[PDB]
Amino acid sequence: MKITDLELHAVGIPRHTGFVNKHVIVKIHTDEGLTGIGEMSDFSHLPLYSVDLHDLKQGLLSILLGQNPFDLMKINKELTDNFPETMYYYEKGSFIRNGIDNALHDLCAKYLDISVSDFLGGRVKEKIKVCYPIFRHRFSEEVESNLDVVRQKLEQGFDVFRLYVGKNLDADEEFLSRVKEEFGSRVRIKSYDFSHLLNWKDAHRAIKRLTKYDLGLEMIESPAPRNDFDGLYQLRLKTDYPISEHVWSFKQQQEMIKKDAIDIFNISPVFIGGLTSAKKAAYAAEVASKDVVLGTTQELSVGTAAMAHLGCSLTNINHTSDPTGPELYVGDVVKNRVTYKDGYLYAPDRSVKGLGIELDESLLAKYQVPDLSWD
Amino acid sequence: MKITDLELHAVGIPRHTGFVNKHVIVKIHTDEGLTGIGEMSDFSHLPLYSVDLHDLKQGLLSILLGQNPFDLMKINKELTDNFPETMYYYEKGSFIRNGIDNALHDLCAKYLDISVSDFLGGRVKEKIKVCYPIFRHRFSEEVESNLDVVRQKLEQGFDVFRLYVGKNLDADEEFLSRVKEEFGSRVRIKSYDFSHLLNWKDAHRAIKRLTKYDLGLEMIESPAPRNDFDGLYQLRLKTDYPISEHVWSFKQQQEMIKKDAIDIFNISPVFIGGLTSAKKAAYAAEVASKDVVLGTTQELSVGTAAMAHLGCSLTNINHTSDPTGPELYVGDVVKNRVTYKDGYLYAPDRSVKGLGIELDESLLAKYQVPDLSWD
Ligand SMILES: [Mg+2]
Ligand SMILES: [Mg+2]
Ligand SMILES: [Mg+2]
Ligand SMILES: [Mg+2]
């Protein structure tokens, strides 16, 4: 069983709002005709530079050519050697490793004629609760429009949301007030995400005023600057609600563990380098008796399916997760998108081997983009 | 006075050893006909991906177009907003910001008809001591070769070196023995650099045996894994010699200051985002009563000149520095290549406005490379 070729398809799929996120669909071919598919999800994040995919295909091929796809530990070590972790949330190297590792899982699973779920440790549950995002308000005028979004998604089954806050507290508070007023207990906002915008003391004051509204609130996410472990710790001591933070590197996770800086580790394959790395992160959390939730960068169906399988295999996910990326896009590049129902993400049919998702060539072509350049 | 255009020239200049590093020469044009030149030094570092320069030029132009080059604080803020610090030693965004900010210094100085030295705080000295690098031995068989290097470079005036260690302590030890044997006090090895290869306890063991040899030893550099602040501290306590570490981000530097983890801050524009950022880092070290030394990524003449001006303006450089990049290359792209005398790097003629270095279009074209792709 050996890797014989690699394909990278750049695609740009617009969100209902207009922004066109760029992703790279991965295909790993073997000598036995089995192909693994993966997704280097959402390259549209700072820094404001873009990677040469022609050069990248060459580098990755030199690494993968002739390898046994089942050598996940060996391959991932080499990937990390070439694409180091940098303690940076949006390191493009993480997205890259993610697409490759996830494609390898699909490949191995297909080879064994089993679902990726069975390759990841099996099932603990068949679905995991997720939430839909309401991006941060900048002006009070944006409130009405977001209430429409809430009413619309609730109508579709999403009764839980997560709100990005910190930019305009008066607006944040107006929104929450309007939500409690109209929906009562029909809607829950499980997290207030500050996206690392405020210093911990400023976040403390914000938390104090926003939490006057508790609509099934489960956590406060990223309430301090990136890598501010001490600030997270101090804030955790002053806040009743669990503090959650994204895991973007083992070094960063190690520090938050050692310093008992947070309560919930937000793990997402794309930010940590793939399923192999995400599992290690989740297990590290488990060994430390810490809670976990699956985060998101807003991936398409292929990337979301990866989390569907991983999420349904973990015993330490005790809160609502975030992967609802497909809901923000007008399209995808698969024959059948991931399944959501009543605010839950379902792990693909366990009887279907591999990831349980299939690429649609006509759609790959339709959304194809020449490169990953910015606008 | 406004920026009207930008040019990015990718160049590949082979090292005497053969390896061809890639750099990007920067030209920032204005409405008054004045052009600032800069250098995005050595992109040939991991991660194993390359930046699209056509896309990069568009992104940088969108930032700089129409701006007043004297608004250094405003521009650097916008540069950092688009190219965030990542606590990673070789973040390509740092090299990018460096080239731009350095070109802005040249541009501003040219406009004012003054040397960059006088735009940076003037002169404290006219030159700074530097050292030539002896890269780490992997096999004892290499000791002979490196000894020939020392003899040749000493003959050329370089009486101070820095030795990279950690791979083969037996070899490092043999080399140090042979050098003390053949040259005695004729040569000094001011630093034993571990390049983050060993965990602090293992480095402690190495240090104990390597420092049996003291040829004007000034510091032990990077004796702990990248960002291992606690490790640096513990090692700072057990080591008599000063501990130095490279500064790659303000967050990293802030933490090393807070924990008093090191004694000497190794600052180099390329790793921190340019002269503006390097000055802030140096001043922060000064406020903290800490020493500074100028580091290097092996830049060419334009990049080295930036440090020559900077180094000669600082009051807290009390040790030998590292910028001898030009010595490793077979050529450059300037009319007046940076040279050294008796192991010293002199600040450029204070009578020459700007950086004091002029590009040579013929050499620029000779060493031109189509892109920054890997080989
Ligand atoms: Mg978040
Ligand atoms: Mg995203
Ligand atoms: Mg060093
Ligand atoms: Mg270098």
PDB file of N, CA, C and O and ligand atoms in Angstrom, chain A residues 15 21 23 41-45 90 95 270-271 296-299 329, ligand 2:
ATOM      1  N   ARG A  15     -19.989  32.856   0.860  1.00  0.00           N
ATOM      2  CA  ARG A  15     -20.879  32.667   1.988  1.00  0.00           C
ATOM      3  C   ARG A  15     -22.147  33.392   1.554  1.00  0.00           C
ATOM      4  O   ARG A  15     -22.123  34.159   0.586  1.00  0.00           O
ATOM      5  N   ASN A  21     -14.561  32.490   0.690  1.00  0.00           N
ATOM      6  CA  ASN A  21     -13.476  31.816   1.392  1.00  0.00           C
ATOM      7  C   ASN A  21     -12.782  30.843   0.457  1.00  0.00           C
ATOM      8  O   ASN A  21     -13.429  30.168  -0.349  1.00  0.00           O
ATOM      9  N   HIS A  23     -10.497  27.456  -0.056  1.00  0.00           N
ATOM     10  CA  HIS A  23     -10.135  26.194   0.567  1.00  0.00           C
ATOM     11  C   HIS A  23      -9.361  25.402  -0.476  1.00  0.00           C
ATOM     12  O   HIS A  23      -9.339  25.762  -1.653  1.00  0.00           O
ATOM     13  N   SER A  41      -8.953  23.498   5.070  1.00  0.00           N
ATOM     14  CA  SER A  41     -10.011  24.478   5.288  1.00  0.00           C
ATOM     15  C   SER A  41      -9.664  25.934   5.573  1.00  0.00           C
ATOM     16  O   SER A  41      -8.794  26.247   6.389  1.00  0.00           O
ATOM     17  N   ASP A  42     -10.393  26.807   4.885  1.00  0.00           N
ATOM     18  CA  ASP A  42     -10.315  28.258   5.013  1.00  0.00           C
ATOM     19  C   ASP A  42      -8.928  28.880   5.144  1.00  0.00           C
ATOM     20  O   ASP A  42      -8.454  29.126   6.260  1.00  0.00           O
ATOM     21  N   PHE A  43      -8.285  29.134   4.005  1.00  0.00           N
ATOM     22  CA  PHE A  43      -6.971  29.774   3.986  1.00  0.00           C
ATOM     23  C   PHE A  43      -7.131  31.280   4.111  1.00  0.00           C
ATOM     24  O   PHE A  43      -6.147  32.003   4.258  1.00  0.00           O
ATOM     25  N   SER A  44      -8.371  31.751   4.062  1.00  0.00           N
ATOM     26  CA  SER A  44      -8.644  33.178   4.122  1.00  0.00           C
ATOM     27  C   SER A  44      -8.560  33.825   5.499  1.00  0.00           C
ATOM     28  O   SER A  44      -9.525  34.420   5.976  1.00  0.00           O
ATOM     29  N   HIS A  45      -7.396  33.709   6.128  1.00  0.00           N
ATOM     30  CA  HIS A  45      -7.146  34.312   7.433  1.00  0.00           C
ATOM     31  C   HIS A  45      -5.789  35.012   7.350  1.00  0.00           C
ATOM     32  O   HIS A  45      -4.987  34.696   6.471  1.00  0.00           O
ATOM     33  N   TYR A  90      -3.880  31.077  13.406  1.00  0.00           N
ATOM     34  CA  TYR A  90      -4.093  30.800  11.991  1.00  0.00           C
ATOM     35  C   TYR A  90      -2.863  30.444  11.158  1.00  0.00           C
ATOM     36  O   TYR A  90      -2.745  30.884  10.018  1.00  0.00           O
ATOM     37  N   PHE A  95      -3.264  24.264   8.549  1.00  0.00           N
ATOM     38  CA  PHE A  95      -4.340  23.957   7.601  1.00  0.00           C
ATOM     39  C   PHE A  95      -3.856  22.893   6.622  1.00  0.00           C
ATOM     40  O   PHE A  95      -4.592  21.966   6.245  1.00  0.00           O
ATOM     41  N   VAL A 270      -8.368  21.638  11.896  1.00  0.00           N
ATOM     42  CA  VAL A 270      -7.720  22.646  11.062  1.00  0.00           C
ATOM     43  C   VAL A 270      -6.680  23.520  11.777  1.00  0.00           C
ATOM     44  O   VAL A 270      -5.662  23.887  11.184  1.00  0.00           O
ATOM     45  N   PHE A 271      -6.922  23.845  13.046  1.00  0.00           N
ATOM     46  CA  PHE A 271      -5.991  24.693  13.790  1.00  0.00           C
ATOM     47  C   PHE A 271      -4.875  23.940  14.489  1.00  0.00           C
ATOM     48  O   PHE A 271      -3.923  24.560  14.972  1.00  0.00           O
ATOM     49  N   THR A 296     -14.292  25.479  15.105  1.00  0.00           N
ATOM     50  CA  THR A 296     -14.406  25.534  13.658  1.00  0.00           C
ATOM     51  C   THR A 296     -13.779  26.769  13.026  1.00  0.00           C
ATOM     52  O   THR A 296     -13.601  27.799  13.676  1.00  0.00           O
ATOM     53  N   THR A 297     -13.439  26.649  11.750  1.00  0.00           N
ATOM     54  CA  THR A 297     -12.917  27.775  10.998  1.00  0.00           C
ATOM     55  C   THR A 297     -13.929  27.991   9.868  1.00  0.00           C
ATOM     56  O   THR A 297     -13.710  28.789   8.958  1.00  0.00           O
ATOM     57  N   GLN A 298     -15.050  27.277   9.965  1.00  0.00           N
ATOM     58  CA  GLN A 298     -16.122  27.309   8.964  1.00  0.00           C
ATOM     59  C   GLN A 298     -15.688  26.445   7.784  1.00  0.00           C
ATOM     60  O   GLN A 298     -15.469  26.959   6.687  1.00  0.00           O
ATOM     61  N   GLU A 299     -15.545  25.143   7.994  1.00  0.00           N
ATOM     62  CA  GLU A 299     -15.129  24.297   6.888  1.00  0.00           C
ATOM     63  C   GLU A 299     -16.305  23.826   6.045  1.00  0.00           C
ATOM     64  O   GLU A 299     -17.464  24.083   6.381  1.00  0.00           O
ATOM     65  N   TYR A 329     -22.224  28.735   3.784  1.00  0.00           N
ATOM     66  CA  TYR A 329     -21.883  28.745   2.365  1.00  0.00           C
ATOM     67  C   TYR A 329     -23.074  28.482   1.447  1.00  0.00           C
ATOM     68  O   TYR A 329     -24.006  27.762   1.812  1.00  0.00           O
TER      69      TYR A 329
HETATM   70 MG    MG C   2     -12.155  30.402   9.253  1.00  0.00          MG
END
